[PDB]
Short mmCIF file of C-alpha atoms (C1' of nucleotides) in Angstrom, two decimals:
data_model
loop_
_atom_site.label_atom_id
_atom_site.label_comp_id
_atom_site.label_asym_id
_atom_site.label_seq_id
_atom_site.Cartn_x
_atom_site.Cartn_y
_atom_site.Cartn_z
CA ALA A 1 -37.60 -11.26 52.68
CA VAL A 2 -35.15 -9.27 49.97
CA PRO A 3 -37.64 -7.22 48.40
CA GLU A 4 -34.90 -4.44 47.90
CA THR A 5 -33.36 -7.05 45.13
CA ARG A 6 -36.69 -6.98 43.07
CA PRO A 7 -36.26 -4.56 39.81
CA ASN A 8 -37.93 -1.30 40.36
CA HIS A 9 -38.02 2.16 38.32
CA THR A 10 -36.22 3.82 41.58
CA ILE A 11 -33.02 2.64 42.87
CA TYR A 12 -32.19 3.52 46.50
CA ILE A 13 -28.57 4.82 47.03
CA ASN A 14 -27.04 5.08 50.33
CA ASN A 15 -23.54 5.57 52.01
CA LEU A 16 -23.60 9.08 50.16
CA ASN A 17 -21.22 11.60 51.62
CA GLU A 18 -23.30 14.01 53.98
CA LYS A 19 -21.25 16.91 53.54
CA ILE A 20 -22.85 17.28 49.82
CA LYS A 21 -25.64 19.67 49.76
CA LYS A 22 -28.94 19.16 48.10
CA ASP A 23 -28.52 20.86 44.70
CA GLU A 24 -24.83 19.78 43.84
CA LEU A 25 -25.99 15.85 45.06
CA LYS A 26 -28.73 16.10 42.64
CA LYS A 27 -26.67 17.76 39.97
CA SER A 28 -24.01 15.05 40.50
CA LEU A 29 -26.53 12.37 40.46
CA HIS A 30 -28.27 13.41 37.36
CA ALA A 31 -25.18 14.13 35.37
CA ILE A 32 -23.82 10.32 36.29
CA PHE A 33 -27.22 8.73 36.02
CA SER A 34 -28.63 10.22 32.77
CA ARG A 35 -26.71 8.14 30.34
CA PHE A 36 -28.63 5.10 31.56
CA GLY A 37 -32.05 6.76 30.23
CA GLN A 38 -34.67 9.24 31.09
CA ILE A 39 -34.84 10.33 34.95
CA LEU A 40 -38.27 11.12 36.04
CA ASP A 41 -36.81 12.84 39.36
CA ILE A 42 -34.02 12.56 42.12
CA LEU A 43 -35.32 12.82 45.70
CA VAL A 44 -32.67 13.77 48.38
CA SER A 45 -33.49 15.47 51.84
CA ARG A 46 -31.15 16.16 54.40
CA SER A 47 -33.14 15.64 57.50
CA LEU A 48 -31.81 13.33 60.17
CA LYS A 49 -33.31 9.85 59.03
CA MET A 50 -33.02 11.08 54.96
CA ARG A 51 -29.47 12.12 54.78
CA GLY A 52 -26.46 9.86 53.11
CA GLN A 53 -29.14 8.73 50.78
CA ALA A 54 -30.99 9.28 47.31
CA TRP A 55 -33.88 7.93 45.21
CA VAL A 56 -33.19 8.14 41.39
CA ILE A 57 -36.76 7.43 39.72
CA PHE A 58 -36.15 6.15 35.75
CA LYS A 59 -38.93 6.42 33.52
CA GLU A 60 -38.21 2.86 32.48
CA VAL A 61 -37.08 -0.11 34.61
CA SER A 62 -34.51 -1.23 32.30
CA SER A 63 -32.72 2.27 32.95
CA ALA A 64 -32.61 1.43 36.68
CA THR A 65 -31.26 -2.07 36.23
CA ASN A 66 -28.53 -1.06 34.09
CA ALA A 67 -27.82 2.12 36.27
CA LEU A 68 -27.52 -0.24 39.49
CA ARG A 69 -25.28 -2.70 37.90
CA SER A 70 -23.04 -0.16 36.49
CA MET A 71 -22.51 2.27 39.24
CA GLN A 72 -22.81 -0.42 42.36
CA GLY A 73 -19.64 0.69 44.54
CA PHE A 74 -18.64 3.70 42.25
CA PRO A 75 -16.27 5.99 44.44
CA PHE A 76 -18.27 9.29 44.52
CA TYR A 77 -17.28 12.10 46.65
CA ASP A 78 -14.69 9.35 48.43
CA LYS A 79 -17.15 6.59 49.58
CA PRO A 80 -18.35 3.69 47.36
CA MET A 81 -22.29 4.14 46.21
CA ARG A 82 -24.67 1.53 47.89
CA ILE A 83 -27.50 0.62 45.64
CA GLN A 84 -30.33 -1.31 45.90
CA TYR A 85 -33.68 -1.18 44.12
CA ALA A 86 -36.58 0.59 46.11
CA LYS A 87 -38.60 -1.34 48.27
CA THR A 88 -41.80 0.29 46.83
CA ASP A 89 -42.72 2.09 43.98
CA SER A 90 -42.22 5.93 44.19
CA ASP A 91 -45.43 7.80 44.24
CA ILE A 92 -45.01 9.11 40.87
CA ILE A 93 -44.80 5.71 39.34
CA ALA A 94 -47.65 4.38 41.39
CA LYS A 95 -49.88 7.19 39.99
CA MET A 96 -49.30 5.86 36.68
CA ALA B 1 -3.85 -14.83 45.93
CA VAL B 2 -5.86 -12.75 43.44
CA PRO B 3 -9.62 -12.84 42.88
CA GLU B 4 -10.37 -15.72 40.21
CA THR B 5 -11.63 -14.02 36.96
CA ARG B 6 -11.64 -17.12 34.75
CA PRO B 7 -14.93 -17.81 33.89
CA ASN B 8 -16.95 -21.07 35.48
CA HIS B 9 -20.27 -22.32 35.71
CA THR B 10 -19.93 -21.80 39.46
CA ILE B 11 -19.85 -18.19 41.29
CA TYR B 12 -18.20 -18.33 44.79
CA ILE B 13 -19.69 -15.49 46.96
CA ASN B 14 -18.38 -14.39 50.20
CA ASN B 15 -18.81 -11.90 52.70
CA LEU B 16 -22.14 -12.97 53.47
CA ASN B 17 -24.18 -12.16 56.54
CA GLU B 18 -23.27 -15.00 58.57
CA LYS B 19 -26.58 -14.55 60.79
CA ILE B 20 -28.68 -15.56 57.89
CA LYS B 21 -29.38 -19.34 58.50
CA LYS B 22 -28.49 -21.95 55.33
CA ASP B 23 -32.28 -22.41 54.41
CA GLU B 24 -33.05 -18.85 53.99
CA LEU B 25 -29.68 -17.94 52.57
CA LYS B 26 -30.17 -20.52 49.75
CA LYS B 27 -33.91 -19.17 49.04
CA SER B 28 -32.88 -15.35 49.04
CA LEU B 29 -29.74 -16.67 46.64
CA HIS B 30 -32.11 -18.44 44.40
CA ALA B 31 -34.46 -15.43 44.17
CA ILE B 32 -31.67 -13.14 43.24
CA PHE B 33 -29.66 -15.32 40.76
CA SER B 34 -32.80 -17.02 38.79
CA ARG B 35 -32.80 -13.86 36.62
CA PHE B 36 -29.27 -14.65 34.91
CA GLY B 37 -30.23 -18.12 33.94
CA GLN B 38 -30.86 -21.90 35.21
CA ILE B 39 -29.52 -22.53 38.67
CA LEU B 40 -28.27 -26.47 39.07
CA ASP B 41 -27.53 -26.05 42.75
CA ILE B 42 -26.78 -23.48 45.61
CA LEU B 43 -24.05 -24.84 48.14
CA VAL B 44 -24.20 -23.38 51.34
CA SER B 45 -22.40 -24.88 54.74
CA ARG B 46 -22.51 -23.33 58.10
CA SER B 47 -19.67 -25.01 59.56
CA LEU B 48 -16.49 -22.56 60.66
CA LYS B 49 -14.61 -22.84 57.19
CA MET B 50 -17.77 -22.57 55.26
CA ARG B 51 -20.01 -19.80 56.78
CA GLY B 52 -20.10 -16.34 55.19
CA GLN B 53 -19.98 -18.37 51.63
CA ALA B 54 -21.97 -19.86 48.87
CA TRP B 55 -21.24 -21.70 45.37
CA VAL B 56 -24.00 -20.88 43.07
CA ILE B 57 -23.82 -23.27 39.90
CA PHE B 58 -25.28 -22.19 36.45
CA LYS B 59 -26.15 -24.43 33.70
CA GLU B 60 -24.24 -22.07 31.26
CA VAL B 61 -21.10 -20.26 31.79
CA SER B 62 -22.88 -17.06 30.24
CA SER B 63 -25.33 -16.82 33.26
CA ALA B 64 -22.50 -16.87 36.03
CA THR B 65 -20.60 -14.12 33.72
CA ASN B 66 -23.92 -11.80 33.67
CA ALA B 67 -24.55 -12.66 37.43
CA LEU B 68 -20.85 -11.88 38.70
CA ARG B 69 -21.08 -8.52 36.57
CA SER B 70 -24.40 -7.66 37.70
CA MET B 71 -24.33 -8.58 41.53
CA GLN B 72 -21.03 -7.69 42.37
CA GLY B 73 -21.20 -5.49 45.46
CA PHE B 74 -25.05 -5.78 45.95
CA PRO B 75 -25.99 -4.87 49.46
CA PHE B 76 -27.49 -8.14 50.66
CA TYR B 77 -28.52 -8.41 54.39
CA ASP B 78 -26.28 -5.01 55.18
CA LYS B 79 -23.22 -6.48 53.41
CA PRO B 80 -21.85 -5.94 49.95
CA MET B 81 -21.61 -9.37 48.11
CA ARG B 82 -17.88 -10.22 47.17
CA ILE B 83 -18.33 -12.45 43.60
CA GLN B 84 -15.55 -14.58 41.94
CA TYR B 85 -15.57 -17.22 39.85
CA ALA B 86 -15.06 -20.73 41.42
CA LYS B 87 -11.57 -21.95 41.12
CA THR B 88 -12.50 -25.52 40.07
CA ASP B 89 -15.62 -26.85 38.32
CA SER B 90 -18.47 -28.03 40.81
CA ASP B 91 -18.79 -31.93 40.74
CA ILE B 92 -22.04 -31.65 39.00
CA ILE B 93 -20.53 -29.68 36.18
CA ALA B 94 -17.26 -31.93 36.07
CA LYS B 95 -19.19 -35.19 35.38
CA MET B 96 -20.68 -33.52 32.39
CA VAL C 1 -18.90 13.63 35.02
CA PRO C 2 -16.15 12.29 32.91
CA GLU C 3 -14.64 9.55 35.41
CA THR C 4 -17.98 7.85 35.11
CA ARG C 5 -17.99 7.51 31.30
CA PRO C 6 -16.63 4.38 29.87
CA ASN C 7 -13.15 4.69 28.57
CA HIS C 8 -10.54 2.16 27.13
CA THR C 9 -8.62 2.60 30.45
CA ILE C 10 -9.63 2.13 34.16
CA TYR C 11 -7.88 3.89 36.97
CA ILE C 12 -7.94 1.79 40.14
CA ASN C 13 -6.87 3.46 43.47
CA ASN C 14 -6.84 2.27 46.98
CA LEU C 15 -4.36 -0.28 46.47
CA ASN C 16 -2.19 -1.70 49.20
CA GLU C 17 0.95 0.51 48.94
CA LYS C 18 3.18 -2.12 50.35
CA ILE C 19 2.89 -4.36 47.15
CA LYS C 20 5.98 -3.86 45.14
CA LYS C 21 5.52 -3.05 41.10
CA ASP C 22 6.52 -6.49 39.84
CA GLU C 23 3.90 -8.35 42.01
CA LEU C 24 1.27 -5.47 41.61
CA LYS C 25 1.66 -5.32 37.75
CA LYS C 26 1.79 -9.19 37.49
CA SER C 27 -1.36 -9.55 40.13
CA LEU C 28 -3.35 -6.78 38.06
CA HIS C 29 -2.60 -8.68 34.59
CA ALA C 30 -3.88 -11.92 36.23
CA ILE C 31 -7.15 -10.10 37.28
CA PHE C 32 -8.02 -8.12 34.57
CA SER C 33 -6.57 -9.71 31.44
CA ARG C 34 -9.73 -12.37 31.63
CA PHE C 35 -11.89 -9.54 30.81
CA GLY C 36 -10.28 -8.90 27.36
CA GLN C 37 -6.84 -7.98 25.75
CA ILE C 38 -4.78 -5.41 27.91
CA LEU C 39 -2.41 -3.02 25.87
CA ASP C 40 -0.64 -1.87 28.89
CA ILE C 41 -0.63 -1.34 32.90
CA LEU C 42 0.93 1.51 34.47
CA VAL C 43 1.90 1.59 37.90
CA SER C 44 4.20 4.10 39.67
CA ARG C 45 5.57 4.36 43.42
CA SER C 46 6.37 7.95 43.32
CA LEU C 47 4.50 9.84 45.85
CA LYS C 48 1.54 11.13 43.88
CA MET C 49 1.23 7.91 41.68
CA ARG C 50 1.21 5.20 44.58
CA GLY C 51 -1.83 3.38 45.46
CA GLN C 52 -3.13 3.75 41.81
CA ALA C 53 -2.69 2.12 38.51
CA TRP C 54 -4.29 2.40 34.84
CA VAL C 55 -5.46 -0.49 33.02
CA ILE C 56 -5.60 0.00 29.53
CA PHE C 57 -8.04 -2.28 27.33
CA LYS C 58 -7.82 -2.91 23.59
CA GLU C 59 -11.77 -2.30 23.72
CA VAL C 60 -13.97 -0.38 25.80
CA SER C 61 -16.26 -3.19 26.79
CA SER C 62 -13.37 -5.00 28.45
CA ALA C 63 -12.86 -2.04 30.47
CA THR C 64 -16.48 -1.83 31.43
CA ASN C 65 -16.91 -5.60 32.22
CA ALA C 66 -13.79 -5.39 34.43
CA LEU C 67 -14.79 -2.25 36.27
CA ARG C 68 -18.60 -3.50 36.84
CA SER C 69 -17.35 -7.19 37.84
CA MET C 70 -14.18 -6.26 40.11
CA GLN C 71 -15.61 -2.77 41.92
CA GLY C 72 -14.83 -3.09 45.43
CA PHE C 73 -13.45 -6.56 45.33
CA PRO C 74 -10.86 -7.04 48.27
CA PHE C 75 -7.07 -7.05 46.97
CA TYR C 76 -4.14 -7.43 49.38
CA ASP C 77 -6.86 -6.77 52.04
CA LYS C 78 -8.19 -3.36 50.45
CA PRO C 79 -11.23 -3.07 48.57
CA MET C 80 -10.18 -1.99 44.85
CA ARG C 81 -11.80 1.62 43.85
CA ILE C 82 -12.41 1.66 40.10
CA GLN C 83 -13.18 4.62 37.94
CA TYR C 84 -12.72 4.80 34.35
CA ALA C 85 -9.79 7.31 33.32
CA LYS C 86 -10.69 11.15 33.14
CA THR C 87 -8.80 11.29 29.67
CA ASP C 88 -7.78 8.67 26.92
CA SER C 89 -4.40 6.95 27.79
CA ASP C 90 -2.05 8.39 25.15
CA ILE C 91 -1.47 4.76 23.37
CA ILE C 92 -5.32 4.92 23.03
CA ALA C 93 -5.33 8.85 22.12
CA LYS C 94 -2.56 8.10 19.29
CA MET C 95 -4.77 4.90 18.07
"C1'" A D 1 -34.25 -21.73 69.25
"C1'" A D 2 -31.54 -17.04 71.37
"C1'" U D 3 -27.12 -14.06 73.38
"C1'" C D 4 -21.76 -14.13 73.39
"C1'" C D 5 -16.24 -15.63 71.83
"C1'" A D 6 -13.92 -16.75 67.28
"C1'" U D 7 -13.79 -17.11 61.98
"C1'" U D 8 -13.51 -13.09 55.25
"C1'" G D 9 -12.97 -18.97 54.82
"C1'" C D 10 -12.96 -22.11 47.58
"C1'" A D 11 -16.24 -26.09 48.70
"C1'" C D 12 -19.17 -30.72 46.84
"C1'" G D 13 -15.19 -24.56 66.34
"C1'" G D 14 -16.00 -22.78 71.66
"C1'" A D 15 -19.04 -20.51 75.70
"C1'" U D 16 -24.22 -19.59 78.37
"C1'" A E 1 -24.39 29.81 56.44
"C1'" A E 2 -19.84 27.89 59.15
"C1'" U E 3 -18.11 24.73 63.16
"C1'" C E 4 -18.42 20.74 66.18
"C1'" C E 5 -21.46 16.49 68.08
"C1'" A E 6 -24.97 12.34 66.66
"C1'" U E 7 -26.91 9.66 62.57
"C1'" U E 8 -26.14 4.06 57.41
"C1'" G E 9 -30.97 5.90 57.45
"C1'" C E 10 -36.40 2.97 52.51
"C1'" A E 11 -38.42 8.05 51.43
"C1'" C E 12 -42.04 10.95 48.71
"C1'" G E 13 -31.99 15.76 65.33
"C1'" G E 14 -28.66 18.52 69.30
"C1'" A E 15 -24.83 22.95 70.35
"C1'" U E 16 -22.10 27.80 69.43
"C1'" A F 1 17.05 -4.64 51.36
"C1'" A F 2 13.97 -4.13 55.56
"C1'" U F 3 11.40 -0.44 58.61
"C1'" C F 4 9.00 3.97 60.30
"C1'" C F 5 6.76 8.76 59.33
"C1'" A F 6 3.81 11.11 55.56
"C1'" U F 7 0.46 10.28 51.09
"C1'" U F 8 -6.51 8.38 49.05
"C1'" G F 9 -3.13 10.78 44.98
"C1'" C F 10 -5.86 11.02 37.28
"C1'" A F 11 -1.08 9.60 34.96
"C1'" C F 12 1.37 8.39 30.64
"C1'" G F 13 11.22 12.43 54.33
"C1'" A F 14 13.71 9.46 58.13
"C1'" U F 15 17.54 4.40 60.46
#
RNA sequence: AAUCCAUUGCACGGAU
RNA sequence: AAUCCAUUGCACGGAU
RNA sequence: AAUCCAUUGCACGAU
């Protein structure tokens, strides 16, 4: 009923400022989130259905959990980050 | 009146999505909060003054504290959870 | 970058500007003192300082618990917006 | 049950 | 590219 | 003092 509550390698961030372009958004997300552990990748698209959102894929679940708990609601480009766990494993995680 | 930050066995959650019925709310709250320690009870009522709200009663204060620090603002049925400590001991805790 | 790096001081903005300084400082101490010892709470109502406060904790763990636990929580009908101070408070920098 | 009005409320309502 | 309109969206748009 | 306009700002105007 609430699979977005289940710890995952990947955190799902939405309510992101949609004026930020892909390169700056990924650089900023990497600078903020890398103190929680090794990031495998950050997935951002600016298409209609994907804007305002990012998937931050951590090597370790423990890093994802500490990232979500620490950065929940953080004011980022004038908007509080909204963070859940990804509903399903990112392909790069499932592949391992 | 300020948010209550004095630790207590019980956490008081509001800003809950009032479309979720009592039995599903309790089941979903149990699934989220059981990772912080042993839950003694979850009190939900749908009366006028009690809807949007839940009391989660932890066996140890340490579990409430971790629950509040970790799940504050968690996007739960499209609304960020607002978590304080309960102002006063729940009855199950008081007769202990 | 630095506003996301733990610091002794938390920076709060989006505060209800109608709250006067004494009640704001007393209310912020009641909220934040439960996370650990507070060295100081700096509030000014000047044009550039209003809607904002700096809460200086003795230990960084207190500031981290405070920011994580109270992020977004409504205060005088406005969600508190909490970051780490970009630079150490003078009282910390001196210590 | 459902839709609608109203309710942000610290505990152990109204309409079709 | 920019501007305006629309979009809060769980993945691996329209107009000058 | 109260109110209106303006200000979302990282410090150590009007009756």
